[PDB]
């Protein structure tokens, strides 16, 4: 076959992976991977062009990002602006793209039956784009809003500060429109020139995943990508920075320039060194810095020419000891030089990656195709699956080679802290970031180059947590499709399901510990939290090995008590669990740690002011709608009465009375489940003298019930971001089969029209979201928007949209209606693809205490019965502006600066303004809880 340079059929894969794979290279030079998965619900494709922002024209910063936007807005064969995205939406799909420095990546997914259709449309992007004239003037605004949202984010400012000291890759209105106009530059022509010059077939990689045979996929990709053109396009210090952040954060970033290690994939020297320097076990860098009271966290490793980084957060004491911190880093590195490369370590890493690969979790299709699409430019067809996991050559010379770059003489150090506020003299141009730059004194350098051996630093030791028993226990005779309650006592309820799907030797063990004293008042909530933070900080050293060994855990405070999840290989899981609970029940608090963690928590309470407007809106709606909720402010205030004595006294009391609800799910037997449950119970009894809680003490909170025909608005100002956010909530009623499918069908139907009208056409903002809101057994319809436009306008536009939608639902045909039905049906019936997603589903059924495990089938069966009439009258009853049962609440978050045709917006009534949340709550009824 003339069209194929070569076919590499065998492609090394995990033996758990039943998908099939075929690699080829087309005539025009494109590398392709094909993936057949006859089980899959969604198909997916991705395309990665090995060009990105580093290749922008010097006079038009941001051009390639802009191009990435422009490819989506129409082709010769499909000229409708959103034919592509509407198709996707109408076929259970979605799509996105990103631009990195050396890559541009476009990917989508879709219902498995319309792959070919999506793909045909997708193919057109690379053959003929319209670059519509009208699309351009709007979309430069889309790009501008993208940058606007990020402006006051700390990470982006650090990112760009490091790069500037150098192009600005993102672009904005200035760089993409204003400045080019001023300088006689035609931007459309430039786009055309860039597209023609750099979007060469030879720089492309495609991956496609679908239900189709490997042969059918082959023909699809041959057909649609053979015709791309191939025009042989060649592939293209000692400074200190003191930076003022937006949030109150304290960090130190240390970075060393290194060569591009990508080609060393068979050894991965940067990962070896990252592994070693980034360790959190006994003997480690972090362990010393933390003992010294200087740091809470450390990350080390390679960052994308390339860099090697080591970043840490800072306690109050640390901020004044940055120089010594760095001295220790250099001592540890010197330790690594002195001992030289270690074959045994490499062998462990190689083994752990091998095991991780054999039992890797099945990926979400979109991510898998996108990721592989990215990495096909770097690896032979046959190795693309394993290249990122499988180490093969031990190469101590490369490891040493990279170690030679981690020297005080090519170091860059950046400190981010509010303490530099006012003490700075430079301003970064694009984001406005205030900072000072200074030469590191040669004497400090000299001292570091002479970093001595301390002995407080040891290599880690053998990881004893490495699992070695992988037997999959056989499926029980009496197995059931949903979790079963296999133990029901005063102290504890145990739900259990043996895995009958995934067949990896893993499990998830979840426990809610209920106690009323965890949330009785702000002080107790603060204490519960500080307690759990202290416990995790103290377990960290021991737990880290386990985490490397595919055993992790999550421990956090909730409104009901405490939450514990242990996941991973079950070979060693009860050992970790036993250490956690035993330490939980016998915890002794170190004072220094208490002061440090308390201070960190104080700052995190403060940092809420710098969240996004829409995060604020969700937060306040949450406060408004829940019977009891403590604000971040109240917690902060209450935080000062937390002393060591008080916490020490609180802990035994918190544990003194409990109820435990658990879901144990994975590769474990009933006897082993009962065993684990009983181990927990007995440990708690032994060490904390726990007794059962009374049935009557199991309070769940209710949701405020809004009055018929009312509209309430709650308004607040964001002090940090110069955008606004709004959330609009139409509360409907309690959950039940029909109300749920009415709301869900409506959300499904209005889902894509809203994006296309409110964002793509009317450009109300970057963030435009809609959908069901479910809390506390109640539900309703919500809208979330973040915008430059004032809230009252957003309101009027959403209301006009809702009317457009009613008219549109009336006017639509039987078949289109059934298409919406069929699409909702597929969405609802989507099987979880990996263990922890199924666990999440069951846990959701359990924590709400609705226990409707077969809800998806009942509701979909019922869904198929519904007609236009039903939805029209639902809408008329619950949603329309003059609906007898309208219940509308709105949260307005004003921009810092903000003050306190188009289809036709209806006249709206005067809203009632909420002055004080507590009064609002006191003055309204509460819903029931949902019956189990």
């Amino acid at each position: 076959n003339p069209a194929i340079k070569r076919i590499g059929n065998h492609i090394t894969k995990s033996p758990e992976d039943k998908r099939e794979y075929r690699g080829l290279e087309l005539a025009n030079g494109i590398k392709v991977l094909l993936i057949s998965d006859p089980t899959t619900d969604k198909s997916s494709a991705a395309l990665d062009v090995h060009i990105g922002s580093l290749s922008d024209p010097p006079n038009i910063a941001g051009l390639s990002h802009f191009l990435e936007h422009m490819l989506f807005l129409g082709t010769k064969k499909y000229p409708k602006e959103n034919e592509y995205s509407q198709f996707l939406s109408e076929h259970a799909g979605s799509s996105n793209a990103f631009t990195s420095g050396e890559h541009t990546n476009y990917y989508f997914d879709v219902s498995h039956e319309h792959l070919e259709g999506a793909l045909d449309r997708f193919a057109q992007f690379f053959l003929s784009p319209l670059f519509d004239e009208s699309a351009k003037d709007r979309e430069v605004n889309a790009v501008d809003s993208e940058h606007e949202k990020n402006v006051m984010n700390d990470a982006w400012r650090l990112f760009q500060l490091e790069k500037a000291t150098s192009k600005f890759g993102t672009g904005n209105k200035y760089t993409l429109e204003t400045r080019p106009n001023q300088e006689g530059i035609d931007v459309r022509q430039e786009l055309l020139k860039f597209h023609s010059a750099y979007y060469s077939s030879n720089l492309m990689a495609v991956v496609v995943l679908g239900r189709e045979s490997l042969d059918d996929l082959t023909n699809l990709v041959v057909k649609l990508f053979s015709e791309v053109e191939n025009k042989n396009v060649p592939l293209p210090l000692k400074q200190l920075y003191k930076i003022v952040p937006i949030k109150d954060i304290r960090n130190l970033y240390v970075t060393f320039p290194i060569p591009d290690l990508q080609k060393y994939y068979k050894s991965n020297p940067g990962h070896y060194l990252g592994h070693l320097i980034g360790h959190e076990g006994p003997g480690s860098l972090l362990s010393e810095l933390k003992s010294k009271g200087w740091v809470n966290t450390l990350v080390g490793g390679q960052k994308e020419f390339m860099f090697f980084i080591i970043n840490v957060d800072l306690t109050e004491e640390g901020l004044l000891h940055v120089e010594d911190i760095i001295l220790h880093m250099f001592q540890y590195i010197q330790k690594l030089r002195a001992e030289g490369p270690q074959e045994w370590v490499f062998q462990e890493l190689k083994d752990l990656n091998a095991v991780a690969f054999r039992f890797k979790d099945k990926e979400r299709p979109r991510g898998y195709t996108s990721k592989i699409a990215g990495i096909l430019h770097y690896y032979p067809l046959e190795e693309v699956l394993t290249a990122e996991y499988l180490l093969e050559e031990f190469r101590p010379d490369l490891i040493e080679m990279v170690l030679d770059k981690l020297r005080p003489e090519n170091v860059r150090v950046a400190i981010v802290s509010k303490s530099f506020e006012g003490k700075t003299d430079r301003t970064e141009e694009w984001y406005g970031t205030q900072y000072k730059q200074e030469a590191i004194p040669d004497e400090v350098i000299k001292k570091w180059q002479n970093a001595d051996l301390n002995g407080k630093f040891k290599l880690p030791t053998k990881n004893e947590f490495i699992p070695t028993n992988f037997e999959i226990l056989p499926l029980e005779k009496e197995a059931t499709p949903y979790p079963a309650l296999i133990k029901d006592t005063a102290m504890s309820k145990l739900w259990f399901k043996q895995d009958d799907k995934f067949f990896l030797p893993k499990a998830n063990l979840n426990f809610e510990f209920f106690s009323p004293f965890a949330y009785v008042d702000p002080l107790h909530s603060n204490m519960a939290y500080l307690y759990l933070e202290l416990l995790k900080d103290s377990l960290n050293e021991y737990a880290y090995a386990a985490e490397l060994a595919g055993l992790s855990y999550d421990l956090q405070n909730t409104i009901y008590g405490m939450y514990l999840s242990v996941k991973g290989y079950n070979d060693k899981q009860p050992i970790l669990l036993k250490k956690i609970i035993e330490k939980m029940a016998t915890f002794e608090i170190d004072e220094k740690r208490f002061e440090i963690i308390k201070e960190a928590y104080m700052r995190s309470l403060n940092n809420f002011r710098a969240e996004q407007p829409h995060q604020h809106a969700m937060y306040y709606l949450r406060l408004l709608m829940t019977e009891v909720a403590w604000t971040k402010d109240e917690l902060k205030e209450a935080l000062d009465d937390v002393t060591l004595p008080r916490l020490k006294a609180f802990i035994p009391q918190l544990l003194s009375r409990l109820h435990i609800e658990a879901l144990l799910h994975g590769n474990i037997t009933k006897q082993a489940a009962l065993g684990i449950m009983q181990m927990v119970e007995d440990t708690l009894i032994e060490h904390a003298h726990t007794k059962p809680l009374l049935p009557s003490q199991l309070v769940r909170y209710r949701e405020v019930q809004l009055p018929d025909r009312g509209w309430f608005v709650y308004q607040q100002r964001n002090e940090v971001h110069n955008n606004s956010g709004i959330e609009i909530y139409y509360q409907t009623d309690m959950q039940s089969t029909s109300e749920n499918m009415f709301l869900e069908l409506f959300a499904q139907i209005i889902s894509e029209p809203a994006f296309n009208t409110l964002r793509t056409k009317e450009q109300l903002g970057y963030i435009v979201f809609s959908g069901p809101r479910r809390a506390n057994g109640i539900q309703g319809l919500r809208f979330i928007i973040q915008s430059e436009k004032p809230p009252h306008y957003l309101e009027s536009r959403v209301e006009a949209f809702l009317i457009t939608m009613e008219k549109s639902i009336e006017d639509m045909t039987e078949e289109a209606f059934q298409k919406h039905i069929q699409a909702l049906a597929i969405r609802r019936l989507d099987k979880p693809k990996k263990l922890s997603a199924e666990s999440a589903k069951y846990w959701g059924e359990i924590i709400s205490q609705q226990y409707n495990f077969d809800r998806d089938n009942t509701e979909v069966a019922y869904l198929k019965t519904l007609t236009k009439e039903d939805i029209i009258k639902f809408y008329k009853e619950m949603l329309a502006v003059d609906a007898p049962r309208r219940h509308k609440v709105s949260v307005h978050v004003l921009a810092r600066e903000m003050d306190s045709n188009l289809s036709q917006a209806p006249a709206l009534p005067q809203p009632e303004v909420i002055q004080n949340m507590t009064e609002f709550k006191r003055g309204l009824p509460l819903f029931p809880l949902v019956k189990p």
Partner: antibody, heavy 127, light 102 residues
Framework: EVQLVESGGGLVQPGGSLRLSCAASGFNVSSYSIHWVRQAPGKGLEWVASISSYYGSTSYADSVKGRFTISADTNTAYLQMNSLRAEDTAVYYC??????????????????????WGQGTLVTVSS | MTQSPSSLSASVGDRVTITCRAVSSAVAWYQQKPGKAPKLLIYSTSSLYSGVPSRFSGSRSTDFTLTISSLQPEDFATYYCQQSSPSFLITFGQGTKVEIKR
């Protein structure tokens, strides 16, 4: 099919000059290391010089320091002999490193093999 | 640095062992037939090059040792133990001449 070729050997009046060429084929000299190893007549294997063209590094034997030069054009390597003593008469072989991107600068050396050698050229030096 | 011995002699089918004593704590092996260029036998002091007879093993007791268990009639050549050291330096031994024994 990887392979090497040596060329330039002949008969040179002592204190003369010669330029050998290790014509490479099947791989790029840029990301491999080219060694030059001369055997005497009836004596043992002796190493002369080497070059890592990626790290642009070179290395010569203490037998010849300011009388030899190893360089390479990226697809051949060239050993340049200057003022050749009567004892430099021998057979020179040139090999490459089995592993790519060997790091020249090192503290502990790692004996990787050399998988592909040339079949040498014999330079005879006598007046 | 050194090798042992000057040479070795033995029958076909016999067991020959060469010891090369040597920073760099490894060693590689080459088999040279009289006249031709050297041939690579073992690279990591343990593992052998690709497409080499399985009868060549690299061992270590300290000293390093190449071993020919089922010596054939075409494995009668000179054997070189090489080192690679700091400073980009290469170094071979004086050669082990394996001779056939009548």
């Amino acid at each position: 099919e990887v392979q090497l070729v040596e060329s330039g050997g002949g008969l040179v009046q002592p204190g003369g000059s010669l330029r050998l060429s290790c014509a490479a084929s099947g791989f790029n000299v840029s990301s491999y290391s080219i060694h030059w190893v001369r055997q005497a007549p009836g004596k043992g294997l002796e190493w002369v010089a080497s070059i890592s063209s990626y790290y642009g590094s070179t290395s010569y034997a203490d037998s010849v320091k300011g009388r030899f030069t190893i360089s390479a054009d990226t697809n051949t390597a060239y050993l340049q002999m200057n003022s050749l003593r009567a004892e430099d008469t021998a057979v020179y072989y040139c090999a490459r490193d089995r592993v790519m991107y060997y790091w020249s600068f090192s503290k502990y050396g790692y004996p990787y093999g050399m998988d592909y050698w040339g079949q040498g050229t014999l330079v005879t030096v006598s007046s | 640095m050194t090798q042992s011995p000057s040479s070795l002699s033995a029958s076909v089918g016999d067991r020959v062992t060469i010891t090369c004593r040597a920073v760099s704590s490894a060693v590689a092996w080459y088999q040279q037939k009289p006249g031709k260029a050297p041939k690579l036998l073992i690279y990591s002091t343990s593992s052998l090059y690709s497409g080499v007879p399985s009868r060549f093993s690299g061992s270590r007791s300290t000293d390093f040792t190449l071993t020919i268990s089922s010596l054939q009639p075409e494995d009668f050549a000179t054997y070189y133990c090489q080192q690679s050291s700091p400073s980009f330096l290469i170094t071979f031994g004086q050669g082990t001449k394996v001779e056939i024994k009548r």
